[PDB]
Design a protein around this ligand. Structure first.
Ligand SMILES: C[C@H]1O[C@H](O[C@H]2[C@H](O)[C@@H](O)[C@@H](O[C@H]3[C@H](O)[C@@H](O)[C@@H](O)O[C@@H]3CO)O[C@@H]2CO)[C@H](O)[C@@H](O)[C@@H]1N[C@H]1C=C(CO)[C@@H](O)[C@H](O)[C@H]1O
Ligand SMILES: C[C@H]1O[C@H](O[C@H]2[C@H](O)[C@@H](O)[C@@H](O[C@H]3[C@H](O)[C@@H](O)[C@@H](O)O[C@@H]3CO)O[C@@H]2CO)[C@H](O)[C@@H](O)[C@@H]1N[C@H]1C=C(CO)[C@@H](O)[C@H](O)[C@H]1O
Ligand SMILES: [Ca+2]
Ligand SMILES: [Ca+2]
Lengths: 588, 588
C-alpha cells in the first residue's frame, strides 16, 4: 500500500474526547488505496495488569470510510472506555490484501507487533473533559442576519452625520458616504426580521469611530453617537431577545483607530506616552508619509492593519492591553446580555490572548458563541480552548466556485470533504456560512441577476452542516460589487423589492429551522449522480432529507417524491438546468 | 507524484516562530518521490497593497531535504519577514519532472494558481513571540545524574527506617526493602559527582511517603523524615549550586498516596469529605477488594494509577486541586531555588493544568526546565506553553534495540529521523536521554555484561541532540533487572567498582561538555556506511565532530584521523566489531 499517505496525529481532530467516557478517532489513508481499517484499542494498563486471558487487541473495532477529498480517504470510529484511558493502533489492509499494523512506533507485520507493550500504541492517556471542545446547542437552531448598521434603516434623523445623503438603495455608495442608518432603525424593523424567520442578528461595529464602517475604533466603551446610546442598545437587545433573536457584536481588537485617545497620546508624547507599548512602534516619533490613497502608506514606523496608517496594531502581548480588551469584552456581555462575539482579523492576535478571552467569556456565559473571522484553515483556533467556530469562507467559496464557474461536481465534493475533515465533528456544525458580506460582492451580482442560480446557491448552502447567515437585503435581491458597492442603503420601497425571492427565502429558512435543524445527530452524504448533478442527503435514525441539484445543461428526471418540501420547477419529476428539488422520506 | 504523501500542517512543528522576525517551515513528502521543493512566501498584504510590480511569489526560496524516516522525506527552510506576516505555498517537483503548487487550497498547476489572492496561501498570520517555544540555554551544557535517594548513600543512620538492611550493592532488593539512603548521603558524595563531571542532579521523589520509592505521597510540603528536613535540603541545593550542579525534583501530581490526610478524610467522611471532589470516586464509600498483590485490585470504586488501590487519582480539573498543586510547585522553587521539575505520569494530567503550571513556573524563573515523563509521542505538550521536553524513551529505545537486537542501521536512522521531525528544532535539543532508569533494567545487564557494548551505547547516545543523563552507578558498571532489581545500593566498595568504565565515563562526559556542547547552532548527520556501520556527524561553521560505530561482525578500516578524541581500539585506523572512534576536524 501507499504507506506515505497513511497518517494518524494523536491528540488532535483525529483523536478527541466527546464526553466523559467516549472518544472519536480518525485515520487518513491514500484515496482508494486501503480496503479496510480496524481499530485495536483498550485501557493501556489492562494488558500487563489484569489477570484475565482476554486482551483488548483480540477484538478489533471496525472503522468506517466517512469522507474522501480526492487525494486521501478518511476513516472514523467512536470508542467507549470506562477506565477513561486508551491505547490504540490501526489494522490497515490495502487493495492487494497486504495487512499491516500502524501505531505510534510505525508500520509492522501483525506477527512483529509488540501488542503486549502499552508503549507500542498511540495514546489518549486520560479522557479530560476540561480540555475538550464544546458546542453551544442554541447555535444549531439559528439562522443569522447580518446588518451593516449605517445602511439598514435610519430610525432617527436627529443623530445623522453631517452630509448625510437621501436614502436610496439604487445609489452606488462612495467610500466616505453617510446615509444615517442607526440602532433605532434596527429596532423599527425587528418585525421584518421575525417575519423572515431570523433568529440571530450579527452587527458590524457599533462603537464610536469616525468612519461609516467603524473598524477604526475611537472608543470601545461607547455606542457611536450617530447610532445611539447605551439605553437604546439595551432596549434593542431586550426587544431582540423578546422575539427569540440572539445578538452578536463585532470585536475589532487587532487594531485601534488613530483618533483614539491612546494613539493620540502616542503622537503627543512619543515613547514617554503611557500607551507607547500598547502598540508596535519601530521608530519614534510614530509617523508615515501620506499618499493620495487614504488607506495606504508605504513607510509607517509602526505596524498596522494591512498598510493603512489609520489602524495601528495593538500589542495584545502587553498585560495592560490584555486587561483593557478583556474589560471591554466583559462589559458588553455583562451589562447588555449579548450572546456572541465576532472577532475581526482574529488570526493576527495571539493564542495566549484568545485563551484568556475564551476563559472570561465562558465564565460569564457557559453557552457563549465565539466566532473568529479567518479566511484560511483555522485548526489551531478550534481545539476547544479559543473560538467556537470561524467564518467559513473556504467552504462557501467552494460552493460559489461550483455554481458560478463550471467546476465538476466531483471537485466541489472533494473540497467540502477536505474542509469537514479538518475539524472536529461538533466544530463543523458551528461554522458560520455566508455567501456574501460587507467585504465581498453581493450574491445577486455574482449570479449576474440570475435569480434561479441565486436560489440554488442559497439552498445548497442552507443544507450544509454549518449555521447559515443572510446578509441584509439578500432577501429582496439587492445588487452590489465589492466594498463600498456591497453596502447600499437597504431597499424598503416595495416597487424595488423582489417579492418572489422574499417568499422563497421565508420558505427556505423554514426548511432549515423546522426540518433540517430538528434531525437528531444526523449525517451528511454527498453523491455525485451526474455531470454537474449532486444529491445531498441529511439523515438521522428516522428521517432522510434529500436535495437534488441539476446544474448541467440537460434536463434531469427523478422519481416522484411523496413529500416535496421545496422545488423550483412546476414538475414533480423534471429538473431543468439550475433547478433543484428538496424532499423528505422515512428511512427503511 | 505521490500527492497523498505530501502534507503541510500550518501553525505546528511544520510552521513556527523562532524569533521576532524569523520562522521555520517544513514540508512532508513521500520518500524519494519529490526531487525539489521551493517556497513562495511573503507578506500576504503586499500582493494587493504595494504599488510595485514585484510580487513575493516571483522569487522562490529553495527548501532543503533535511531528514528521511524511510516512509517520508522532510524538507525545511528558514524565512525572515520584517512585516511579521507570512503567506506561503510550496512548489513541488516529482521524479518525472511534474511540478505543482501546493497551498492551503490544495494542489494546482502553476498556471491555474491564484497567486495574487492572499487567501490562496497557507498563513503565519502575525509572528507572535508570546506563543513561541523557548529553550533554556543552560540545559545545553548539562549532563544529568539520576539519584534514587533510598539507594545512593546512607549519610545518617539515625533517620533509618525500621528494618533497614546492611548496605550491600550485591543484594537483590525486594519491593519493600530499606537500605537507609538519605539526603546527607548525597551531600557527602557531591565530590564524586563533580569529579565525574556531572552538572545536574535528578532526584526521584523525596517528599513524605511510606514506601521506599515515595511515589505514594503522604505530604508534598515536607521532606520525608527518613531522608532529611527542610534545612538539610536547602543545604544540599546550595552545595550543588556552589559546584555548578543544577537540581531537578520529581513532581508526582497525577495521584496521591492513600495515607494522605486528604484520602484518609475521604475514607472517614465519604462524600461529605471536603476532599471528595479532589478525586475520581464513582461510588461511595470508596472501596476495593484486596488481592494477594499489594499493587492490584480489580474493582476499586475510584480511578487510580494503573490498578493500584493505594494511588487514587487526583482531580486536577478541580480548582482547589489546581491551587493546592500550584502552591506545592511554587514552594519548592521559591524557597529552595530548585532548577527544574520532572513530571511523573504527566500525560494523564490535563493540558489546562499544565498551562497554568507553565505560567507559574516561568513567572518565578524564566529559564525553568519542565520535563514530562511520557513514553509515547508528545507533540501536544511541546508547543511552548506546557513542557520544555519529555523523557526521550522512544529515541533511546530505538538506540537500545539497534545495539542489542541486530536491527539494520537503516532502521535505527529511520526511527531517530522520525523522532526529530515530530518536534521543533529547539525542542529536540531539550529532550532528556537516558538508557536506563529506576523503572527499567540496567545498561550493563541489558548488555549481558559486555562492557564494550555498554560503552558503545553510551557514546552513541551522548552524541545525540538531546541532553544526556547517567543513572546512579552506571559509571561503575552496576547490574540489575527490572524494578526492584534496578535499585541496588550504590557500589562504594572499590573492589566491586569497574574503574576502567569510570575513567571512560569521565572522558565521555568531557567530550560532551567541552566539545559537542560548544558547537554553535550545529547540525547532525546520520550516514549508514555499511551493514551495521554508522557515521554520526555534529558540525557547525568551523568544526566537525565525527563518530564511526562498527557494530557488524567484520573489521572496518577508516582513514587515520589527525585528532582522535575517544576510541576503544588501540589502532588509529582499525575498528573491530563493536569498536567506535570519535574525532574532530576543521570544515573545509
Ligand atoms: C480599512 C478597511 O477597514 C474595514 O475593513 C475590515 C473588514 O470589513 C473586516 O471584515 C476585516 O476584513 C479583513 C480581514 O480580517 C483580513 O484577514 C483580510 O482578509 O482583509 C479583510 C479586509 O479586506 O478587517 C478589516 C479591517 O478591520 C472596512 O470595512 C473597509 O471598508 C476598509 N477599507 C478596505 C476596503 C476597500 C474600500 O475602502 C478597499 O478599497 C480599501 O483599500 C481598503 O482600505
Ligand atoms: C506503583 C509503582 O509506583 C512507582 O512507579 C512510578 C514510576 O517509578 C514512575 O517512573 C512512573 O512510571 C509509570 C509511567 O508514568 C506510566 O506512564 C507507565 O509507563 O507505567 C510507569 C510505571 O511502570 O509512575 C509510577 C507511579 O508513580 C514505583 O517506582 C514502582 O516501584 C511501583 N511499582 C510498580 C513497579 C513494579 C515493582 O513494584 C511492579 O512489579 C508493580 O506491580 C508495580 O506496582
Ligand atoms: Ca440616523
Ligand atoms: Ca539514613
Amino acid at each position: 500500500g501507499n504507506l506515505a499517505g497513511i497518517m494518524h496525529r494523536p491528540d488532535s481532530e483525529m483523536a478527541y474526547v466527546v464526553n466523559e467516557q467516549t472518544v472519536n478517532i480518525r485515520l487518513r489513508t491514500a484515496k482508494d488505496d486501503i480496503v479496510s481499517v480496524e481499530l485495536l484499542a483498550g485501557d493501556p494498563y489492562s494488558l500487563r495488569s489484569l489477570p484475565t486471558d482476554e486482551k483488548f487487541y483480540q477484538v478489533p473495532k471496525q472503522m468506517t470510510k466517512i469522507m474522501s477529498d480526492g487525494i486521501s480517504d478518511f476513516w472514523q470510529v467512536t470508542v467507549t472506555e470506562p477506565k477513561r484511558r486508551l491505547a490504540y493502533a490501526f489494522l490497515v489492509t490495502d487493495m492487494l490484501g497486504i495487512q499491516k499494523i500502524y501505531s505510534d512506533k510505525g508500520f509492522f507485520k501483525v506477527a512483529d507487533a509488540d501488542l503486549m507493550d502499552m508503549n507500542f500504541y498511540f495514546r489518549m492517556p486520560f479522557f479530560q473533559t476540561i480540555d475538550q471542545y464544546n458546542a453551544p446547542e442554541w447555535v444549531t437552531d439559528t439562522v443569522w442576519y447580518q446588518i451593516f448598521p449605517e445602511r439598514f434603516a435610519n430610525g432617527d434623523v436627529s443623530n445623522d452625520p453631517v452630509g448625510t445623503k437621501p436614502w436610496d438603495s439604487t445609489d452606488h455608495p462612495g467610500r466616505e458616504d453617510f446615509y444615517g442608518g442607526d440602532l433605532q432603525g434596527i429596532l423599527d424593523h425587528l418585525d421584518h426580521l421575525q417575519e423572515l424567520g431570523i433568529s440571530g442578528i450579527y452587527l458590524n461595529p457599533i462603537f464610536q469611530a469616525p468612519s461609516n464602517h467603524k473598524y477604526d475604533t475611537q472608543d470601545y466603551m461607547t455606542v457611536d453617537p450617530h447610532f445611539g446610546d447605551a439605553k437604546l442598545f439595551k432596549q434593542l437587545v431586550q426587544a431582540a431577545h423578546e422575539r427569540g433573536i440572539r445578538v452578536m457584536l463585532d470585536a475589532v481588537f487587532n487594531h485601534i483607530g488613530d483618533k483614539s485617545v491612546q494613539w493620540q497620546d502616542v503622537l503627543k508624547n512619543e515613547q514617554a506616552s503611557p500607551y507607547a507599548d500598547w502598540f508596535h512602534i519601530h521608530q519614534f516619533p510614530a509617523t508615515y508619509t501620506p499618499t493620495d490613497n487614504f488607506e495606504f502608506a508605504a513607510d509607517a514606523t509602526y505596524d498596522t492593519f494591512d498598510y493603512t496608517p489609520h489602524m495601528p496594531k495593538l500589542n495584545t502581548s502587553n498585560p495592560e492591553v490584555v486587561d483593557y480588551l478583556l474589560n471591554i469584552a466583559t462589559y458588553w456581555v455583562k451589562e447588555f446580555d449579548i450572546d456572541a462575539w465576532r472577532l475581526d482579523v482574529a488570526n493576527e492576535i495571539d493564542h495566549h490572548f484568545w485563551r484568556k478571552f475564551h476563559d472570561a467569556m465562558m465564565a460569564l456565559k457557559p453557552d457563549f458563541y465565539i466566532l473568529g473571522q479567518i479566511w484560511h484553515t483555522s485548526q489551531s483556533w478550534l481545539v476547544g480552548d479559543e473560538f467556537t467556530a470561524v467564518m467559513n469562507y473556504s467552504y462557501t467559496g467552494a460552493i460559489l466556485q461550483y455554481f458560478l464557474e463550471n467546476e465538476s461536481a466531483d471537485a466541489l465534493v472533494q473540497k467540502m470533504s477536505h474542509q469537514l475533515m479538518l475539524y472536529r465533528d461538533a466544530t463543523n456544525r458551528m461554522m458560520f456560512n455566508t455567501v456574501d458580506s460587507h467585504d465581498t460582492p453581493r450574491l445577486m451580482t455574482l449570479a449576474h441577476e440570475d435569480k434561479q442560480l441565486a436560489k440554488s446557491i442559497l439552498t445548497f448552502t442552507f443544507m450544509q452542516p454549518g449555521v447559515p447567515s443572510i446578509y441584509y437585503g439578500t432577501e429582496y435581491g439587492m445588487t452590489g460589487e465589492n466594498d463600498p458597492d456591497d453596502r447600499k442603503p437597504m431597499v424598503w420601497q416595495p416597487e424595488l423589492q423582489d417579492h418572489d425571492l422574499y417568499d422563497f427565502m421565508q420558505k427556505l429558512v423554514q426548511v432549515r429551522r423546522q426540518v433540517i435543524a430538528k434531525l437528531s445527530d444526523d449525517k451528511i452524504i454527498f453523491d455525485v449522480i451526474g455531470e454537474r448533478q449532486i444529491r445531498l442527503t441529511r439523515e438521522d435514525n428516522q428521517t432522510r432529507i434529500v436535495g437534488v441539484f441539476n446544474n448541467g445543461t440537460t434536463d434531469l428526471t427523478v422519481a416522484q417524491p411523496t413529500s416535496i418540501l421545496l422545488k423550483t420547477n412546476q414538475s414533480e419529476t423534471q429538473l431543468a438546468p439550475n433547478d433543484f428539488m428538496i424532499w423528505t422520506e422515512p428511512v427503511r
